[PDB]
Amino acid sequence: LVNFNHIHKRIRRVADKYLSGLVDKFPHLLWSGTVLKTMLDILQTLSLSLSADIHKDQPYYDIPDAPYRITVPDTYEARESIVKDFAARCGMILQEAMKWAPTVTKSHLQEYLNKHQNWVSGLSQHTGLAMATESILHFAGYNKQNTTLGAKKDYSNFMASLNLRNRYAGEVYGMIRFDLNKMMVQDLHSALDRSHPQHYTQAMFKLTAMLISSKDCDPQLLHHLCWGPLRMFNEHGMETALACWEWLLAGKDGVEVPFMREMAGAWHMTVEQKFGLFSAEIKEADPLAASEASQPKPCPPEVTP
Amino acid sequence: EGWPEEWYEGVCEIATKSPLLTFEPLRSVLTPAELSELRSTIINLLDPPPEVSALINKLDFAMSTYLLSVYRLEYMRVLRSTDPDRFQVMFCYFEDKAIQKDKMQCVIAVADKVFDAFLNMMADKAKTKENEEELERHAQFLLVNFNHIHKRIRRVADKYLSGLVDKFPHLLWSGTVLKTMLDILQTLSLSLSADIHKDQPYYDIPDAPYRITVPDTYEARESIVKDFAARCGMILQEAMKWAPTVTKSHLQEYLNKHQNWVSGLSQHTGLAMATESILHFAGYNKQNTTLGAKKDYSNFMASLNLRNRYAGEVYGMIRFDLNKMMVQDLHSALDRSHPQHYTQAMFKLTAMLISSKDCDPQLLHHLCWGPLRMFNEHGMETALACWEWLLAGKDGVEVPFMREMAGAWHMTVEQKFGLFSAEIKEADPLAASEASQPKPCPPEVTPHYIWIDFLVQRFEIAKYCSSDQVEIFSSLLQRSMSLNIGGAKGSMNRHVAAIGPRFKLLTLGLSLLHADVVPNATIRNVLREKIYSTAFDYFSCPPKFPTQGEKRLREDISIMIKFWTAMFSDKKYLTASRGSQLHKYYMKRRTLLLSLLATEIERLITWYNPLSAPELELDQAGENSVANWRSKYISLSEKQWKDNVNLAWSISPYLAVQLPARFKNTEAIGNEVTRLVRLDPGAVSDVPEAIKFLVTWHTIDADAPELSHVLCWAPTDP
């Protein structure tokens, strides 16, 4: 990517051809978690360099979080042309990624917009954030309710997830100023015993926010996180657990295997206990000889979660 | 009305407490000349469309007298009533089943008449806070009846809402209408699919005592929700067009409630509507606001993220007084001069303040006195964000905040910390052979360029609703200016690089004057005199050239052109009370100021780009007007121009001396200036230009050796 904006003519063409071939033969690089950040950073660098007193020397720039450098031409017209040309591949790759796997790329975009460094400069242009918040809109799809109909658009999930994530991250960071896992476990147990949904969600989000900012796995916290919803089987707790699991997967790195193992164990326990689809079968009286006080009535099993 | 006056007067209180004329068949309950006369009188009183008149023409005496009696009763009740439910009682007559079954347009006609009378009544009631509350409640009430089960009820409600929003434009950016309408939209969306065969079609609107009924079939419900889904976008775009900042802040505040977050994983159509309407009504930011042939969303996201994050952070601490810690942290951050700690402390302090039950004046005072110790643009941006959040968050706090801001502004004016700083002189190149080489020393005023914009936005917001903030703005504007046009006393810097904020403040003052708010005819005279006096001050120095770059110059020209037009639009005189004396006294100075401003604008735009440069362009109407004025005033004869020199001398000798510098292609100005300076040489003591108007009594004639006392002038160039 960094050689796509070389000062020469044929170098960028051959780099574009190589990039097209590489992305053609390896489709899974589109939804990776590092390409998008780097390309947004280089786009922001070019946008900042658009107006930087051409007569002033030192056209070099340093890309943050990656050792590289970028040179720019002298005239304004060439710089505007190159930035406008580069501003199209971003949208192309973003729409290509959004077409196939929307959930992972949407979660990555949500995670990108939660860095403290960019918030101060957000009052200025900061073209990367604008590009992200513009590309989020016109590539969305239908939700569960309106996915199968014969002849609407949904954005509430994005905003709700972002707001909850930022709010609870701030709340958990505020407490650390003044061990502490015991308090979280006790609060979760009390909420489960009292059967209260609001405290359930608050404890779940606080626990996952505390876990996401640490240096150790702390297996007891993960085990209690996985064994959480099974004691409050419903759809609201299931939605909260899915949101927390998605945040945990998108936040930390090198944690997929233990989480998958714990989820598989919980699934096997659920299968064994006959708590859901695997429940027992109940018979009902036949109407031909149901003159007794045991009148017939449907008894269908319910499996929402 | 028309017999003791007590007889007519006594009917008013009787009608005040009289019950409604409600009601079984109606007709069962109940001389052509007199019938014709009463029909003529009632048709003259009503003046309806001809169909209603045709319907009336076939009515006997009973229905006509019933209509007349009810019209009189309702008119008297609405005119002399005092209850807060004045005009909404008329819908009670619409819900009667007996009246509907009768073989009706008269009722809606008299409703239109009484609504027009009520609307006319409130147009000049007062400008206090309670009238705003009454109007807000009426507007909220009208919305809930837009989805009535009947047919004509929603039509008349829509017409009334359109009229009310037409005559009171300020209700668009109110802070309660949007929440209620979003809530009712969400209620309808939820009720869209609710098992039609199940009973109880009623619903309760949260945070407002009302109820909504829905039809039976799916098609009618879908049609009504789709129809209602358009007025939302219409009013949202109308509000966004005029005042984007306040409505954007309100939308940001709405999306920060805990109740909706849990259900946000579902549809929750209100949040989707808000986050869809935010996009395609945005505008350009400061960088890309004035260019000749981009879109901005970073501010919204940054503000929302910072607000939520710091609200959560401040809420987390309260689990385990505390204002002392915040004050100490802010003081330490200011002393150490660290920006990150500065912003963190500011946001934490405002988040703590926004969630309390008392004003706590020390916290507000420290919040206002914050940026003045770290004068820059980053702290100014942080302070503006915090002030906007504080204003949008709490209610009933505007007045103390405005007072504290005015006090801080006055202190800044006094301390000479910004635009009001002192003037620094530099060595002249003719005799600068010393080690003190010449170099530009321009004052820098970045932060003062945004505070004026904030003041303009607040004044535009508060022009209609309040009546006390106008006095605060007038007091603030009066104490910054002074009528001391002269040498080195004007309380304002005279450098070229500081012409933006000066003329922006002048334009704000002119806009305040044109707002027609000050009742008396004496404050306006003093304010206008000060405006003109401080406008004439800038032209008392030798001309020079701008030192800033290519940017930060176009908007200055735009501001100058806008101010020139606003100055041109004062033919509003002739009623300031011998008015002719003051009229001509103002007209002459207006003409002179317009000429000087036109010359300055022409010079600056000439300096902008040397070549013609057809690609670059500015506003066309202003340039055409300037060219027309130049063509008009360039044709003056030898007379009516020497008289101008006398007026300039009467204003101030320095302005008269600096007149030929602004070149005029006529030699009479020099002769008149020489004659005036010969008549009185002691009034001027500025050597670099005035000395040559007195020294040469005659170039080569070598006569008249008198009155030449040059033993007092300051040294000049070798």
Side-chain angles (χ1 to χ4, degrees), chain B residues 18 40 42 58 67 91 102 119 123 125 149 160 180 228 240 244 253 300 359 366-367 398 472 514 570 573 689 697 700:
Chain B
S18 299
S40 61
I42 195 172
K58 57 175 58 181
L67 175 54
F91 286 89
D102 190 10
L119 182 56
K125 185 60 178 299
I149 194 178
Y160 285 160
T180 301
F228 186 82
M240 191 81 66
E253 182 63 29
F300 184 94
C359 297
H366 285 72
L367 174 61
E398 296 81 0
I472 298 298
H514 280 353
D570 228 293
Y573 293 160
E689 313 90 318
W697 74 95
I700 202 60

Side-chain angles (χ1 to χ4, degrees), chain A residues 116 122-123 125 143 154 156 167, chain B residues 258 264 267 285 296 298 309:
Chain A
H116 309 161
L123 304 183
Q125 274 290 345
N143 72 291
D154 312 294
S156 179
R167 169 63 181 267
Chain B
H258 309 161
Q267 274 290 345
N285 72 291
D296 312 295
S298 179
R309 169 63 181 267

Side-chain angles (χ1 to χ4, degrees), chain B residues 640-707:
Chain B
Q640 85 252 10
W641 213 352
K642 301 168 57 182
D643 181 74
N644 302 17
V645 182
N646 301 327
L647 181 140
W649 184 266
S650 300
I651 294 299
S652 181
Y654 300 91
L655 183 59
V657 170
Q658 290 288 349
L659 188 59
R662 318 292 177 174
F663 175 78
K664 312 299 178 60
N665 190 18
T666 294
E667 293 78 6
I669 291 91
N671 304 127
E672 188 64 28
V673 168
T674 302
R675 166 177 167 265
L676 277 183
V677 72
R678 180 184 298 181
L679 254 297
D680 187 10
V684 287
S685 295
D686 49 332
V687 286
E689 313 90 318
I691 188 181
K692 67 187 185 67
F693 291 153
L694 174 61
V695 165
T696 159
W697 74 95
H698 288 88
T699 289
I700 202 60
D701 304 333
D703 52 353
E706 86 293 329
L707 72 93

Side-chain angles (χ1 to χ4, degrees), chain B residues 189-489:
Chain B
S189 64
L190 183 140
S191 175
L192 173 62
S193 303
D195 189 11
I196 53 161
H197 284 105
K198 200 269 305 175
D199 62 328
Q200 300 299 139
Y202 302 90
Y203 292 91
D204 296 329
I205 297 92
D207 308 78
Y210 289 106
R211 52 177 59 258
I212 287 298
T213 62
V214 296
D216 47 1
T217 62
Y218 282 105
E219 280 66 23
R221 202 168 305 179
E222 200 277 341
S223 178
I224 187 59
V225 67
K226 176 169 293 181
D227 201 328
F228 186 82
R231 303 287 296 185
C232 178
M234 193 275 297
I235 65 178
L236 280 180
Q237 73 91 5
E238 285 292 337
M240 191 81 66
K241 175 187 176 182
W242 287 14
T245 302
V246 48
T247 179
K248 190 173 302 179
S249 188
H250 282 178
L251 290 181
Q252 291 183 0
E253 182 63 29
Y254 171 78
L255 301 180
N256 293 331
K257 294 196 299 181
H258 309 161
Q259 298 82 313
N260 305 126
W261 288 351
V262 179
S263 181
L265 304 183
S266 299
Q267 274 290 345
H268 193 54
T269 319
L271 260 52
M273 168 56 62
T275 192
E276 193 275 340
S277 180
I278 183 55
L279 174 103
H280 42 87
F281 302 120
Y284 307 144
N285 72 291
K286 315 175 186 301
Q287 295 187 1
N288 302 334
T289 183
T290 52
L291 281 88
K294 197 175 182 179
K295 289 190 175 182
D296 312 295
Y297 324 94
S298 179
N299 179 29
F300 184 94
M301 314 296 294
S303 179
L304 183 60
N305 296 333
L306 286 174
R307 187 166 303 180
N308 281 332
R309 169 63 181 267
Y310 280 92
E313 185 178 10
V314 73
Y315 176 77
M317 181 180 296
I318 207 60
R319 293 281 76 181
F320 305 148
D321 190 72
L322 292 180
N323 322 86
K324 316 299 296 181
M325 331 305 298
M326 322 299 181
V327 174
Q328 190 67 23
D329 294 1
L330 180 58
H331 278 175
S332 180
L334 283 182
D335 294 330
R336 202 184 62 180
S337 68
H338 198 283
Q340 218 70 19
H341 290 55
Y342 172 89
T343 55
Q344 291 182 6
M346 200 71 59
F347 268 100
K348 193 172 302 178
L349 175 61
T350 184
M352 213 292 303
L353 180 57
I354 203 182
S355 62
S356 180
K357 312 301 174 301
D358 54 75
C359 297
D360 219 7
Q362 55 276 20
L363 295 185
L364 192 63
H365 171 259
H366 285 72
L367 174 61
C368 293
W369 276 17
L372 269 60
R373 304 164 186 174
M374 200 183 179
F375 233 73
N376 62 83
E377 70 287 348
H378 170 251
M380 220 58 181
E381 290 273 80
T382 304
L384 287 183
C386 293
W387 295 352
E388 180 63 30
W389 183 19
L390 176 59
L391 277 181
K394 200 175 297 181
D395 56 331
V397 81
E398 296 81 0
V399 183
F401 180 81
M402 293 302 297
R403 186 179 298 101
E404 294 291 338
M405 188 212 62
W409 173 270
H410 184 268
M411 210 284 289
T412 286
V413 171
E414 179 270 328
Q415 266 196 1
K416 303 180 179 61
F417 229 105
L419 172 63
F420 313 91
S421 61
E423 185 175 356
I424 305 178
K425 292 182 175 59
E426 68 285 347
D428 45 355
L430 294 180
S433 299
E434 211 259 358
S436 61
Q437 301 89 17
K439 55 181 181 61
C441 301
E444 175 266 347
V445 273
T446 300
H448 276 64
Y449 193 80
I450 323 177
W451 206 347
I452 311 299
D453 299 1
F454 175 79
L455 293 184
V456 167
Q457 293 288 156
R458 186 48 54 184
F459 173 77
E460 290 291 340
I461 291 303
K463 182 172 60 180
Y464 305 95
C465 172
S466 298
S467 179
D468 299 1
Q469 309 182 24
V470 183
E471 312 299 328
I472 298 298
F473 281 152
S474 177
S475 180
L476 183 140
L477 286 184
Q478 187 275 343
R479 306 179 71 178
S480 177
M481 303 153 51
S482 60
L483 55 157
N484 259 17
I485 165 183
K489 43 199 66 58

